[PDB]
Write a protein that binds this ligand. Structure first.
Ligand SMILES: [Cu+2]
Length: 124
């Protein structure tokens, strides 16, 4: 199954957001990150990727397609707007083994407020 995540300058959650900010996919699913507005990209957050997973970083303005292979929770950010809180969470499969470790990862304050909300919406 294929899912879409859009990158916007303004959404229901405020400025510089990923929509949706939290998504549960299955092992092997594909998510396409699409900058609806210009100036955004997607990159994995340091310490918020499962064991076995490869980090990634898309180019600004590109539609980025990723097939998630290793199960667990992945923290993602927009490079330029990470300090402003532009972050999302992708859970791949059931019972993420790295769920406790991603909760402890350190992020700038606004990014931390949105990641905690997003982890809570997954039922974590
Ligand atoms: Cu951005």
């Amino acid at each position: 199954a294929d899912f879409e995540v859009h990158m916007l300058n303004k959404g229901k959650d405020g400025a510089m957001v990923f929509e949706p900010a939290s998504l549960k996919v299955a092992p092997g699913d594909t998510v396409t990150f699409i900058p609806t507005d210009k100036g955004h990209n997607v990159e994995t957050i340091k310490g918020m990727i499962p064991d076995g997973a490869e980090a990634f970083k898309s180019k600004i303005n590109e539609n980025y397609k990723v097939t998630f292979t290793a199960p667990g929770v992945y923290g993602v950010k927009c490079t330029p707007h990470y300090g402003m809180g532009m972050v999302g969470v992708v859970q791949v499969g059931d019972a993420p083994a790295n769920l406790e470790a991603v909760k402890g990862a350190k992020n700038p304050k606004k990014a931390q407020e949105r990641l905690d909300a997003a982890l809570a919406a997954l039922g974590n």
